[PDB]
Amino acid sequence: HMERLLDELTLEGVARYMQSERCRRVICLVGAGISTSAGIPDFRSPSTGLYDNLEKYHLPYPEAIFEISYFKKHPEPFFALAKELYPGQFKPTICHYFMRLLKDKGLLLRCYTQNIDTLERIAGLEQEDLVEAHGTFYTSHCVSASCRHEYPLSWMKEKIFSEVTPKCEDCQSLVKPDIVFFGESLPARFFSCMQSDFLKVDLLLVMGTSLQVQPFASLISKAPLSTPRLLINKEKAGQSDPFLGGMDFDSKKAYRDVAWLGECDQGCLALAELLGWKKELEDLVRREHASIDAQS
Annotated binding site for Zn(2+): 142, 147, 168, 171
Tell me: does residue 143 bind Zn ion (CB under 5 A): no
Tell me: does residue 171 bind Zn ion (CB under 5 A): yes
Minimum CB distance to Zn ion, residue 139 (Å): 14
Minimum CB distance to Zn ion, residue 154 (Å): 18
Residues tagged in the binding site annotation: 32-36, 42-44, 114-117, 142, 147, 168, 171, 209-210, 233-235, 264
135 and 178 Cβ atoms separated by less than 8 Å: yes
Residues 5, 80, 147, 254: which binds Zn ion (CB under 5 A)? 147
Interacting positions 103-142 with Zn ion (CB under 5 A): 142
Tell me: does residue 199 bind Zn ion (CB under 5 A): no
Nearer to Zn ion, 79 or 97 (CB): 79
Nearer to Zn ion, 80 or 147 (CB): 147
71, with CB counted inside 10 A (0-12, 13-18, 19+), is buried
User: Looking at 74, 134, 141, 289, which residue is catalytic?
Assistant: 134
Is 149 noted as a catalytic residue in this protein?
A: no
Nearer to Zn ion, 111 or 142 (CB): 142
Minimum CB distance to Zn ion, residue 220 (Å): 39
Tell me: does residue 170 bind Zn ion (CB under 5 A): yes
Residues 74, 149, 157, 289: which binds Zn ion (CB under 5 A)? 149
Q: What is the dihedral of CA 59, 65, 69, 74, to 10 degrees?
A: 60
User: How many residues of this chain bind Zn ion (CB under 5 A)?
Assistant: 8
One-letter-per-residue 3-state SS of the chain: CCCCCCCCCCHHHHHHHHHCCCCCCEEEEECHHHCHHHCCCCCCCHHHCCCCCCHHHCCCCHHHHHEHHHHHHCCHHHHHHHHHHCCCCCCCCHHHHHHHHHHHCCCEEEEEECCCCCHHHHCCCCHHHEEECCEEEEEEEECCCCCCCEEEHHHHHHHHHHCCCCECCCCCCEEEEEECCECCCCCHHHHHHHHHHCCCCCEEEEECCCCCCCCCHHHHHHCCCCCCEEEEECCCCCECCCCCCCECCCCCCCCCEEEEECCHHHHHHHHHHHHCCHHHHHHHHHHHHHHHHCCC
Nearer to Zn ion, 169 or 235 (CB): 169
Minimum CB distance to Zn ion, residue 57 (Å): 25
Stretch that binds Zn ion, among 13-21, 27-35, 172-180, 204-212 (CB under 5 A): 172-180
Nearer to Zn ion, 167 or 289 (CB): 167
Minimum CB distance to Zn ion, residue 144 (Å): 5
Name the site residues for Zn ion (rule: CB under 5 A).
Answer: 142, 144, 147, 149, 168, 170-171, 173
Provide the annotated active-site residues: 134
